[PDB]
Design a protein around this ligand. Structure first.
Ligand code: CHL
Ligand code: CHL
Ligand code: CHL
Ligand code: CHL
Ligand code: CHL
Ligand code: CHL
Ligand SMILES: CCCCCCCCCCCCCCCCCC(=O)OC[C@H](CO[C@@H]1O[C@H](CO[C@H]2O[C@H](CO)[C@H](O)[C@H](O)[C@H]2O)[C@H](O)[C@H](O)[C@H]1O)OC(=O)CCCCCCCCCCCCCCCCC
Ligand code: CLA
Ligand SMILES: CC(=C/C=C/C(C)=C/C=C/C=C(C)/C=C/C=C(\C)C=C=C1C(C)(C)C[C@H](O)C[C@@]1(C)O)/C=C/[C@@]12O[C@]1(C)C[C@@H](O)CC2(C)C
Ligand SMILES: CC1=C[C@H](O)CC(C)(C)[C@H]1/C=C/C(C)=C/C=C/C(C)=C/C=C/C=C(C)/C=C/C=C(C)/C=C/C1=C(C)C[C@H](O)CC1(C)C
Lengths: 56, 61, 221, 51, 35, 37, 252, 219
């Protein structure tokens, strides 16, 4: 133990997270960007409709 | 029962070569399907006949 | 009332197609009316009002209770040094030696006396539940359930269609929690463990960590 | 139709003779897989693993 | 090095979420064509 | 190899893989027959 | 009259009669092989089970067809009980209910001289029947002597010992032959004839494969020497190693 | 009797003044007993009668259903479990659940499939009872009629208004008796027929007062 390191390359931890602060970083950034998108959905058209896409 | 099978299986290829060639000619002629409707049914069923006939005696060989 | 899919005669019902027709006093102008009064407790219009304050306050406590019971328990499993993370074993943190340290941090609240906690709870909860009935500095004559004003700072409840839509979301998120907070009580009496410890075990082997493994627990003996 | 076809491999590995398990001791052979590992944390650990 | 790994995950998942929530925001109507 | 009641048919079965290549060549033959209308 | 309600949804009654009656109805071949000009004119969409399937022109006019409906419907209804009569005792023979002769083809050989045929009642239990062989025949010829005669005359006994007490101590004449709706319908099923007009389509169709199944029962029992429940279980044990075309060359 | 003013009462002769106004005597089982004033509303008093009758009909099937797997144990028929409240855990048994001592019967093994079939089957027949189903739509919600009464017993309405009073009185007995089976198995721990035999053994010593000091706070 000459040096201290991660020891996490061959471990196969999911999404590369090993410290549970990374999961909150993965999720907390995601929820914030979702929250700004969900509020601003009021401007993006209201397609609550039978068929209202970019149809052909 | 080998030679019973081989004559039956040479018979299959002759019928299949008819059905590969004749059947698109039956469809793509004008009114050729209304005319040879029962004719193709003879050729199709005889194909379905022999494939079980060849299929059953494999247990006997 | 607009065409808002939740209010009026075309509203969805609690048995779907098999409901037929709701009771004659549930006409669909109050939130969460799926027309379920099959015992008829609220046939009187004065009595039917009194359950709606009784339902909505139960919702507004249970939605705090559903998040409040798991969120210290969730962070406790990721290394936050709580005294106890389990919600039904967290009340007895006042009797340990270091006191109730908030977040497990000794330089936070550091409560010692259970009498001092309860002595100041009643003197505050009396006043604000007293203010909820009437009066109080944040609004004098308002609604008993949707006061608004200083209790809606961000202005989210101004349009009469959107505000009539969010009342349906409030009670359905509420009724989800009251049903679920009832679940926390029963699966703590039965299982004896924290409510995510029940979850992480059902994800382990779902065929054998279901509730039927505890079915013979209360056999008369 | 594409979900039922997944079950044919499952039924043939659990009832109809099994499949060739090359990790069997002393050279691989045909093995009926009696106990399939169906743990979601084990199964979904492959998908969110780095490549 | 853990302080650096928690920073890359904030950076990447910021820009990855501008991508995913960017194309959802009615991009196929952001065209000069008319109907 | 093939079964012994089937072994006189080895020369026919050595043609069978090449057949689907002849379907894409047929579609150019047919379009020459309609003279690329 | 019978204001009823649909099973899953919110509307009952007939689903569609126009799939099964009239000119537009299901046929034994689709539209591309068989148009509406190739239909024999004595088969129109006015009876149940009429897919127009008649290559061999046995029927001539619908009056002749109507007496073969008597041969069709009666062959159906006796076959439908037989499929249950064959399979059900064999599985109970398989699981552990001792029928001692549940397999259908060698049932009579189990009761020849010692008699002692054993009967299992679900869910009451197992009861031995201490009747001899000649006692069963005099009952069977005695009852179906009377039963078949009652259909011959068109009338029968007025007394309701047979399983009903709805107080018709009289004979019946105005019934339909092939649909004796009077005493034989205890549980209603009789108000809307449009319901019955679809039920008879289910009746012949459930009947017709039961006639096929008994034909499937007898032949595949003769080939391999098993009851069809034993044939059903072992084909599910391993299908490729146990089918038609592996039992014909099993000796080699 | 059983209708109008002169009828049976819950205090018998000492009952002419305790009877409220709204409990007149057009309904079956109207003994005029609303001591706690619960059904003073005409819509709500209509609503409890569906609750009472359905509880009455489930209890009549609950009474006999809790008895017959123990009376047949006295006829020596082996069950694996003959006590009514211990009967549910026999699908966890090694042999599983056979409908009698016959492994050639139902032979149930998986609890979760048995429950999931129930929530589909009982989930839909309870919905037919409310709105309607294959056996009729616009009927009386409690006495629907013809497909459930094939034998024509619901004719001559003076008999039919009398058979209703037979129904709830057997029923109110059954709901009272099923409240028995719960308590006499919580307190004792044995079956009802078995604890009937305990009382018929020595009645003076085998009563509830033999278990009266059981639930004391031992702290
Ligand atoms: C808000 C409602 C409330 C509820 C449901 C509880 C419940 C509990 N407290 Mg708690 N408390 C509550 C408020 C408060 N407590 C405390 C201070 C303490 C202390 C010091 C301790 C507890 C303990 C307990 C637990 C007893 C173990 C148990 O019951 O076994 C399991 C069974 C259940 C969880 C079922 C309980 C459900 C309950 C019977 C039904 C809920 C309805 C209630 C009747 C409504 C109560 C509100 C009323 C008073 C208006 C239990 C989880 C003890 C503990 O920590 O346990 C180890 C303990 O030592 N509490 C204060 C500060 C004064 C409170 C403020 O209001
Ligand atoms: C004066 C101080 C005062 C304090 C500390 C509280 C405290 C509280 N009130 Mg109360 N109230 C107070 C004045 C008043 N309240 C009310 C009427 C109500 C109602 C109807 C409700 C509350 C609720 C609440 C709780 C949640 C607050 C919230 O929604 O935040 C969110 C907003 C910004 C962060 C909280 C315990 C809610 C509750 O009890 O749910 C559990 C609730 O439903 N209060 C009135 C009448 C207009 C008041 C008048 O001054
Ligand atoms: C998982 C193990 C399991 C097995 C191997 C069986 C198998 C059996 N069940 Mg049982 N069951 C099982 C669990 C369960 N059953 C049932 C509900 C029933 C019912 C309602 C009935 C049975 C019947 C039967 C018996 C077939 C009688 C016969 O001779 O064929 C006669 C039948 C045929 C020839 C056609 C059907 C073929 C097949 C055997 C299906 C019958 C079995 C069940 C419907 C479920 C299928 C189980 C799978 C795993 C084989 C047989 C012992 C039948 C019976 O009780 O007869 C005495 C019957 O009516 N079971 C439930 C609740 C959903 C179970 C859950 O644990
Ligand atoms: C009409 C349908 C019918 C069919 C398909 C069979 C089937 C058979 N019976 Mg028969 N039986 C039938 C009517 C009846 N049998 C019997 C009583 C018997 C006996 C006692 C025996 C047969 C036997 C036979 C077999 C004679 C070969 C054959 C498998 C023999 C047998 O099963 O040997 C293997 C045999 O011993 N049957 C009675 C009661 C009078 C019948 C009613 O009509
Ligand atoms: C009252 C004496 C009497 C007895 C014992 C029978 C006996 C029988 N008849 Mg019969 N019939 C009788 C009177 C008459 N029948 C018929 C015409 C028919 C027909 C068309 C059919 C029967 C059928 C049947 C069988 C089914 C009964 C049923 O529907 O169960 C239902 C309840 C369980 C049964 C063997 C059926 C059968 O099995 O034949 C294939 C059948 O299709 N009977 C007529 C009018 C001619 C009768 C008038 O007296
Ligand atoms: C004139 C005599 C007469 C008397 C006194 C009664 C009395 C009663 N009748 Mg009535 N009846 C009478 C005549 C008649 N009744 C009826 C027909 C009916 C019916 C159909 C019903 C009644 C019912 C009742 C009961 C209504 C009140 C109640 O529920 O108390 C309940 C409260 C007590 C009895 C007091 C507490 C119980 C116990 C004595 C205390 C002992 C404590 C324990 C030892 C320990 C405590 C446990 C602790 C430790 C946890 C009551 C027992 C109802 C009933 O049966 O309720 C169950 C009912 O349904 N009667 C007819 C036929 C026309 C009568 C004919 O004259
Ligand atoms: C080791 C483990 C590591 C884990 C890492 C975590 C990985 C997580 C991966 C998740 C990947 C999912 C990505 C795709 C999401 C798609 C969302 C969407 O297309 O969304 C589309 C829909 C649109 O919803 C609709 O939006 C409508 C908007 O209406 C508005 O707008 C309309 C016109 O636009 C009208 O104007 C109308 O008046 C107006 O009200 C209405 O509100 C409808 O009621 C509503 O159904 O959104 C929705 O349903 C969304 C439903 C799902 C939401 C999920 C949220 C999850 C949050 C988790 C916890 C986060 C905590 C955050 C904390 C933040 C602070 C720190
Ligand atoms: C992708 C598959 C597909 C689809 C969607 C259709 C769709 C249709 N066909 Mg075509 N057809 C197909 C394959 C398909 N067919 C094949 C493979 C053949 C050769 C046998 C035909 C031959 C055919 C004819 C000759 C006719 C149709 C007709 C029809 C029409 C429906 C009427 C009808 O009952 O069909 C008739 C076909 C059947 C009843 C087939 C029997 C049902 C099969 C056996 C079910 C088995 C499904 C099973 C899951 C398959 C296993 C999957 C895999 C392992 C192979 C409809 C447009 C009719 C039409 O358009 O009228 C003019 C018509 O006349 N089809
Ligand atoms: C195939 C089959 C046919 C049964 C026909 C019957 C039951 C006829 C009844 C037949 C009943 C008969 C004939 C009773 C007849 C009684 C009569 C006429 C008595 C009378 C009178 C008189 C004399 C006083 C005169 C008065 O004026 C009229 C009347 C009426 O009052 C049964 C098969 C099965 O039973 C097995 C073999 C095995 C089981 O496992 C499966 C099933 C299917 C159940
Ligand atoms: C009238 C009046 C008047 C005044 O005013 C007031 C007052 C007083 C309040 C009132 C009174 C009331 C009362 C008394 C009530 C009671 C009730 C009940 C008890 C019910 C039960 C009820 C009961 C019930 C249903 C029950 C049911 C049951 C069942 C199904 C069972 C089942 C079972 C079985 C088979 C067997 C198996 O092994 C199991 C089980 C599962 C177990």
């Amino acid at each position: 133990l000459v040096d201290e390191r991660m020891n996490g390359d061959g471990t196969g931890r999911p999404f590369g997270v090993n410290d549970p602060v990374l999961g909150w970083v993965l999720l907390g950034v995601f929820g914030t960007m979702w929250a700004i998108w969900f509020i601003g959905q009021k401007d993006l058209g209201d397609f609550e409709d039978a068929d209202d896409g970019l149809k052909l | 029962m080998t030679s019973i099978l081989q004559v039956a299986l040479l018979a299959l290829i002759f019928v299949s070569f008819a059905l590969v060639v004749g059947v698109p000619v039956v469809f793509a002629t004008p009114n050729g399907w209304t005319d040879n409707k029962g004719a193709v049914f003879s050729g199709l069923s005889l194909w379905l006949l022999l494939v079980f006939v060849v299929g059953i005696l494999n247990s006997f060989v | 009332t607009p065409d808002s899919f939740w209010y009026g005669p075309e509203r969805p019902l609690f048995l779907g197609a098999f409901t037929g027709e709701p009771p004659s006093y549930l006409t669909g102008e109050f939130p969460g009316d799926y027309g379920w009064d099959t015992a008829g407790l609220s046939a009187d219009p004065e009595t039917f009002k009194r359950y709606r304050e009784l339902e909505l306050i139960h919702a507004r406590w249970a939605m705090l209770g559903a998040l409040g019971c798991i969120f210290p328990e969730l962070l406790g499993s990721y290394g936050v040094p709580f005294g106890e993370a389990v919600w039904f074993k967290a009340g007895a943190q006042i009797f340990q030696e270091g006191g109730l340290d908030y977040l497990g941090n000794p330089n936070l609240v550091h409560a010692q006396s259970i009498l001092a906690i309860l002595g100041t709870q009643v003197l505050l909860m009396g006043a604000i539940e007293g203010y909820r009935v009437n009066g109080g500095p944040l609004g004098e004559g308002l609604d008993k359930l949707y006061p608004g004003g200083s209790f809606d700072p961000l202005g989210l409840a101004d349009d009469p269609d959107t505000f009539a839509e969010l009342k349906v979301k409030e009670i359905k998120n509420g009724r989800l929690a009251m049903f679920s907070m009832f679940g926390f009580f029963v699966q703590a009496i039965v299982t004896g463990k924290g409510p995510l410890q029940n979850l992480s075990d059902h994800l382990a082997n779902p065929g054998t960590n279901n509730a039927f493994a505890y079915a013979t627990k209360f056999t008369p003996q | 139709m594409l979900g039922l076809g997944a079950w044919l491999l499952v039924w043939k590995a659990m009832y109809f003779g099994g499949v060739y398990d090359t990790w069997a001791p002393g050279g691989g052979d045909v093995r009926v897989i009696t106990n399939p590992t169906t743990n979601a944390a084990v199964i979904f650990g492959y998908l969110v693993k780095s490549p | 090095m853990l302080t650096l790994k928690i920073f890359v995950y904030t950076v990447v998942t910021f820009f990855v979420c501008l991508f995913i929530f960017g194309f959802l925001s009615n991009d196929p109507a952001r065209n000069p064509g008319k109907n | 190899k093939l079964p012994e009641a089937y072994a006189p048919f080895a020369p026919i079965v050595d043609v069978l893989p090449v057949i689907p290549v002849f379907f894409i060549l047929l579609a150019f033959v047919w379009q020459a027959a309609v003279s690329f209308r | 009259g019978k204001a009823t309600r649909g099973w899953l949804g919110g509307q009952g009654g007939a689903a569609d009669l126009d799939k099964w009656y009239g000119p537009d109805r299901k046929l034994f071949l689709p539209s591309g092989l068989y148009d509406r000009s190739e239909i024999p004119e004595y088969l129109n969409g006015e009876l149940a089970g009429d897919y127009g399937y008649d290559p061999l022109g046995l029927g001539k006019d619908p009056e002749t067809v109507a007496k073969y409906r008597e041969n069709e419907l009666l062959h159906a209804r006796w076959a439908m009980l037989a499929a249950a009569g064959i399979l059900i005792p064999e599985g109970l023979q398989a699981n552990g209910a001792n029928i001692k002769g549940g397999t259908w083809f060698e049932t009579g050989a189990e009761m020849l001289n010692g008699g002692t045929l054993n009967y299992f009642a679900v869910p009451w239990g197992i009861v031995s029947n201490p009747l001899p062989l000649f006692a069963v025949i005099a009952v069977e010829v005695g009852l179906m002597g009377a039963v078949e005669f009652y259909r011959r005359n068109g009338t029968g006994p007025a007394g309701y010992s047979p399983g009903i007490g709805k107080f018709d101590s009289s004979v019946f004449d105005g019934l339909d032959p092939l649909y004796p709706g009077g005493p034989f319908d205890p549980l209603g099923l009789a108000d809307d004839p449009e319901v019955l007009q679809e039920l008879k389509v289910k009746e012949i169709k459930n009947g017709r494969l039961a006639m096929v199944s008994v034909l499937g029962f007898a032949v595949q029992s003769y080939v391999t020497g098993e009851g069809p429940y034993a044939n059903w279980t072992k084909h599910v044990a391993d299908p490729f190693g146990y089918n038609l075309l592996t039992v014909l060359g099993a000796e080699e």
